[PDB]
Ligand binder design. Structure first.
Ligand code: MG
Lengths: 53, 294, 342, 231
């Protein structure tokens, strides 16, 4: 499945609604999500050692 | 209970006092009244029956089965109005229903704004005042069924605030094209997105985007260049707030797919200078803007 | 020392049963046996000054509390137990209460139990996010991913290794992701947002209901109706809303029909089993609702705002992670109610 | 101080928030009182279970959303709480269960205990086809009169006579009662079986413990069959 973009950018899409005026009132989650950014790299990471042996 | 004439004479009219006196001399005070559970003679509410109600009682002077006047002594000589208007307020408007006094005064934008606010929480004022709607495709489609060909109206519209926010909406209706446009306008507001704009006038650089069979080649332009692009792209740029743009469409020129491709290109194929700078850890300077700076 | 107090009552209780039993005995006797003989005695008796005292004291005492009274108005535990006679053996109900007395005092004599896992305590005594260790996560089975044959390679960065034909989730990352997710729940709870807990796998209801209760949130355990968020007016408009103050107490103000039809969108969606709730996740995206979900090795991480890598098949692992998130919400709620007091 | 609008029920986002909230309230009671023993009279099949109808519960349990299986789940929990031993029950359980009892209890019953009259006679009426019978049963020695006439005179068919005797044969009291039967309408079979039905209904007053045996024999059931106009 394609790496989704719209689930981790809710804050940025919401900020466009608020700046334009399409959304009058800031949502309760808005400040919380801004202070705790989601991880959005979704990369494959190399590994250089077998932790068991 | 039997009451003295004095008390009864302060509440009931003189004409009815004789009847009350005779009833209090024929019905013993120790009468144990019983309730009838077969025939309901009295109304379901309390009433002394001393006043004639203008609606719930027969109209004085009107002919009817129980009229007590002689046939030559009726007092209804005008028949152009309803004799007994409804009681109380004068209406029976169901609770929660409004009298249709005014018709045809609705604004479809206000109808879209009210519905979307209730369904999604968007501000009605922004929709009805800040947004501009432009139909892009309006055609009739048809489905072949056993009964016969069923026609439908298809409408593709674009909405935008001319300040970065633009949306594309589609709508279908078997009844009329106006209903299809209403649905498309409704859909377009729900799909509103922000598009990056360089200096709020153009796009960042050039875009070569493929949307299905449509090849879109869009180039940024100098201030005052104007919109020199396919007519479908022109309308979208107008709503979105793009003023300067050049471009050419190759291969498929299907209006529907040009519009969707353009919206997709403006979002998925652009990168702001700020986003490029942060990703690469470099400073990007607009030479033309610095030349005119302090 | 004070047993007589109860003994005084029991004496009356026994006497009352005796009076009632022989009141029913006289209810069978024909009137012809008692009435005429009783009346004859009075015909052969003469009332005295004292006898007359009760002739009118009882008339009023019976014309005041029996006839001219209001029939209605406009030892508490087990108050319906019928005690058995002191000579008779215990009744079944008394034996049950006699066993309950033993269970409280004696049944737990001899030893205490330490370092033993009790399943219910995961729901009722969840730890705080700061006290969670890799050991605790591992004890709950959170590290046990899916079969390597079912691997969704987009989770590669969460995998610690493969063991016994399954992928082992990296608990060091699970802990960091769990702490971040917990802080989000606490923030939204402290801000007054609506938190919905969604889980539709068998057995999850108990955890879901308690999580909602201690965060003053909401839960769905049976089925997510497709369209709950995108088609909310056709599904949830009929249900009742209410206005509440900063202390979460109902204001009692009647709501205008305009306010009772408006969509009430969750501020945060927690999904226990995202692989079976694609509909809800996509609606959350469309509705710009941040979401938290447990991401197993076969689950797509990018579909949620804050993923928590972990086993989603075990009720212990799910309830352990849900409990931590629920307590984080509780602390946020308690911090919001505390700032209102002071 | 700041006020906000929130869903009333914790189950707001479920398919039927009203039913799930009620089920949760009952489930809490069944968890808080898990230990309380259940009635041992349940084996005795106590005849008490007046729960509201599916349609009545739909007023409070989601209306159209209410599903039959959801109503079945409500009854399984209402009965379980109701079947807790009466001595060991508490107010909380009864308070919750009160709201789910049929409101027919508002009124009273229409049945008054039947008793022998001033002359020791049990009077019952019976009907079969177009026939009717009013019998007077008193303690006696087996004397029977039909419309003032001897049984062999009024009823010529021995099978009709055997039908009249059957209820007395079930309780083995053929020689313990005198019967004065009065019958009108229909024919011999309708009248004989209408008398049979009326004797069975009159015998229950003398010993109400034998009603179950009379019902099992089939003599207390009113035969509904009548001549049907061809349709
Ligand atoms: Mg799994």
């Amino acid at each position: 499945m394609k790496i989704q973009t719209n689930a981790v950018n809710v804050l940025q899409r919401t900020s466009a609604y608020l700046k334009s005026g399409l959304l009058k009132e800031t949502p309760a989650w808005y400040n919380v999500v801004a202070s705790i950014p989601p991880s959005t790299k979704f990369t494959r990471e190399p590994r250089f050692k077998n932790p068991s042996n | 209970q039997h009451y003295d004439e004095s008390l009864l004479s302060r509440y009931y009219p003189e004409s009815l006092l004789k009847s009350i006196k005779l009833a209090q001399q024929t019905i013993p005070e120790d009468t144990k009244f019983r309730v009838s559970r077969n025939v309901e003679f009295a109304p379901p509410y309390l009433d002394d029956f001393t006043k004639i109600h203008p609606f719930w009682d027969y109209k004085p002077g009107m002919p009817h089965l129980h009229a007590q006047e002689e046939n030559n002594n009726f007092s209804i000589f005008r028949w152009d109005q309803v004799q007994q208007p409804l009681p109380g307020e004068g209406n029976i408007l169901p609770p929660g229903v409004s009298l249709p006094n005014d018709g045809g005064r609705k604004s479809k934008s206000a109808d879209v704004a009210a519905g979307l606010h209730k369904q999604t929480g968007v501000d009605p004022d922004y929709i009805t005042r800040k947004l501009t709607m432009k139909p892009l495709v309006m055609k009739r489609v048809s489905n072949q069924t056993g009964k016969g060909k069923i026609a439908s109206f298809y409408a593709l519209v674009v909405v935008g605030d001319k300040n970065g926010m633009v949306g594309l909406g589609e709508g279908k209706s078997r009844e009329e094209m106006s209903k299809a446009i209403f649905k498309a306008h409704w859909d377009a507001v729900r799909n509103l997105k922000e598009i990056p704009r360089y200096e709020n006038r153009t796009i960042y650089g050039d875009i070569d985007f493929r949307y299905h069979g449509v090849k879109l080649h869009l180039r940024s332009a100098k201030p005052g260049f104007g919109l020199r692009v396919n007519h479908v792209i022109f309308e979208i740029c107008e709503c979105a707030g793009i003023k300067d743009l050049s471009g050419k469409v190759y291969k498929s020129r299907n209006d529907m797919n040009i519009a969707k491709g353009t919206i997709e290109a403006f979002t998925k194929a652009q990168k702001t200078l700020d986003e490029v700078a942060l990703g690469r850890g470099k400073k990007l300077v607009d030479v033309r803007k610095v030349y005119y700076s302090s | 020392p004070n047993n007589n107090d109860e003994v005084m009552l029991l004496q009356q209780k026994l006497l009352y049963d005796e009076i009632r039993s022989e009141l029913k005995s006289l209810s069978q006797v024909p009137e012809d046996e008692i009435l005429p003989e009783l009346k004859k005695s009075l015909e052969q008796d003469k009332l005295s000054d004292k006898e007359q005292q009760l002739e009118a004291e009882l008339s009023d005492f019976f014309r005041n509390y029996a006839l001219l009274n209001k029939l209605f108005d406009s030892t508490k535990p087990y108050p319906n137990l019928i005690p058995s006679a002191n000579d008779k053996p215990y009744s079944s109900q008394e034996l049950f209460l006699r066993q309950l007395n033993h269970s409280m005092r004696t049944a737990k004599l001899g030893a205490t139990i330490s370092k033993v896992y009790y399943p219910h305590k995961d729901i009722f005594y969840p730890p705080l996010p700061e006290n969670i260790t890799v050991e605790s996560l591992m004890s709950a089975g959170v590290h046990l991913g899916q079969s390597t044959s079912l691997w969704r390679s987009s989770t590669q960065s969460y995998i610690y290794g493969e063991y016994k034909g399954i992928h082992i989730i990296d608990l060091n990352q699970t802990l960091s992701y769990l702490k971040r997710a917990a802080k989000v729940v606490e923030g939204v709870s402290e801000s007054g947002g609506i938190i919905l807990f969604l889980g539709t796998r068998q057995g999850q209801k108990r955890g879901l209901e308690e999580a909602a209760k201690k965060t003053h949130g909401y839960y769905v355990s049976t089925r997510w109706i497709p369209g709950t968020l995108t088609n909310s007016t056709e599904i949830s408009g009929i249900w009742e809303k209410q206005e509440i103050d900063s202390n979460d107490n109902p204001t009692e103000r009647a709501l205008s029909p305009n306010e009772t039809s408006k969509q009430v969108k969750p501020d945060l969606l927690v999904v226990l089993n995202p692989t079976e709730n694609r509909n809800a996740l996509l609606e959350a995206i469309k509705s710009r609702v941040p979401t938290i979900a447990i991401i197993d090795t076969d689950s797509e991480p990018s579909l949620v705002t804050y993923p928590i890598p972990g086993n989603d098949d075990s009720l212990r692992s799910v309830n352990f992670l849900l409990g931590v998130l629920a307590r984080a919400g509780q602390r946020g709620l308690q911090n919001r109610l505390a700032r209102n007091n002071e | 101080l700041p006020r906000r609008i929130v869903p009333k029920l914790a189950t707001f986002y479920s398919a039927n928030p009203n039913h799930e909230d009620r089920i949760n309230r009952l489930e809490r009671l069944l968890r808080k009182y898990i230990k309380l023993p259940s009635q041992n009279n349940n084996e005795a099949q106590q005849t008490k279970a007046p729960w509201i109808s599916f349609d009545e519960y739909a007023l409070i349990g989601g209306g159209t959303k209410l599903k039959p299986t959801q109503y079945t789940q409500l009854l399984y929990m209402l009965n379980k709480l109701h079947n807790i031993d009466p001595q060991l029950t508490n107010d909380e359980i009864t308070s919750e269960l009160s709201q789910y009892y049929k409101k027919s209890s508002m009124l009273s019953n229409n049945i008054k205990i039947k008793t022998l009259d001033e002359f020791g006679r049990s009077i019952a009426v019976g009907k079969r086809k177009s026939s009717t019978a009013k019998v007077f049963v008193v303690r006696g020695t087996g004397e029977i009169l039909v419309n003032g006439r001897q049984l062999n005179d009024y009823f010529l068919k021995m099978k009709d006579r055997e039908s009249i005797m059957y209820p007395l044969q079930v309780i083995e009291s053929v020689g313990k009662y005198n019967i004065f039967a009065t019958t009108s309408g229909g024919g011999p079979t309708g009248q004989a079986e209408s008398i049979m039905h009326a004797i069975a209904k009159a015998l229950v007053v003398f010993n109400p413990l034998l009603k179950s045996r009379l019902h099992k024999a089939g003599v207390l059931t009113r035969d509904y069959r009548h001549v049907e106009r061809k349709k």
